[model samples]
Target: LPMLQVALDNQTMDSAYETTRLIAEEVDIIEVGTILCVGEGVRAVRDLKALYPHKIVLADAKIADAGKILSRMCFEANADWVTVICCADINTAKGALDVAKEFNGDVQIELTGYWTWEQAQQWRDAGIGQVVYHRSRDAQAAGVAWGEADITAIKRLSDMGFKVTVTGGLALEDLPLFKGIPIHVFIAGRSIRDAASPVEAARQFKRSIAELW
Candidate 1:
């Protein structure tokens, strides 16, 4: 089964803490969202790690430069995984992967805008074990809807031997959007965080996947 990662993109640590405590048991991973990290710094990862030591924690720092510095900081802050922008040059990705290796952590190349099979292969060859696939910021801005094409792309990448994560304004209903894709992680934020009942919302997402599979 693909893991369910909850992205805590709340503005304040107080809100993030409360929400995390509420649905921690239902989630496999807790992501310190980019916004939260930018807003609270390492405190976000620290607090969450202190709260759920057993669950995997991802620090979505979205490192674009100085990979070694960012990776070390995230590892020291107790992040089990860190994300690097795929658009970044190979040197940046290699630097981040090297730092992650030093700490025994994992790196994810986020398909932010445009990603190709060649790029994916290069990252894999550089020792990156994971890839993130989803509707890009530009695509969303241009009103491109997520559909079968997106799911097919994810499946294709998975077939290429990369552990793929799918994200992009995902909701419970959007579960069907990735029906047969071999996604290793399903990241959702507002869909659950903004819902009236986060636990129930997460349960619904899990249920949807179970039924589809």
Candidate 2:
């Protein structure tokens, strides 16, 4: 089954917390997104975990370098997972993965800029188990729609044993498009956060996921 992760990118912790509270019951993971991670600090991870001990918390730090140092900070603050940019040096990614092992946490590769199959193979070979496939803010701005190529890439990565997480402007209607694909996580930001009723919107996503798998 695909899991649902809510991206809480609100500028302040209060607003993000407010949104989380509304859809907490339907979300599998709580992502203290980049904006919140930058503005509110890693305390966001600790606070969310303290509030909902059962839900997994992620710090979307998007580490580029100093992977060990950055990831350690996030883990110390009780983050269950953290993200590293795909373009980072293999050792940097491995550094984060090493710390993740120490803390019983996980590292996700955020597929940002250019990346290749060779890089991905290296990540898997190094024992990293997750990567995020972004529809990307730039692509979204350019009005590029999700297509079969996206699905093909996702399926290929899943086949390679990486738990692929798909994000960037996802909505309830887009859920059906991924049916039969082994998606590890489906991420939603504004679609759920800015909805008329966040809980209902989240529940609708859950219903779609249930039907798909």
Best by lDDT: 2
Candidate 1, run of 10 with poorest lDDT: 132-141
Instruction: Please report how far candidate 1 places residue 55 from its true position, in Å.
Output: 0.8
lDDT of each: 0.85, 0.91
For model 2, the superposed segments whose C-alpha errors exceed 4 Å read none
lDDT of 2 by residue, 1-106 (tens): 8999999998888999789879887899999999998888988889988998799999999999999999999999999999999999999999999999999999
Q: Report the C-alpha lDDT of model 1 over 3-42, residue by residue, as the tens digit.
A: 8999898777998988887889989999998889989998
Alpha-carbon shift of residue 63 in model 2 (angstroms):
0.6
- Could you estimate the TM-score for every candidate? 0.93, 0.97
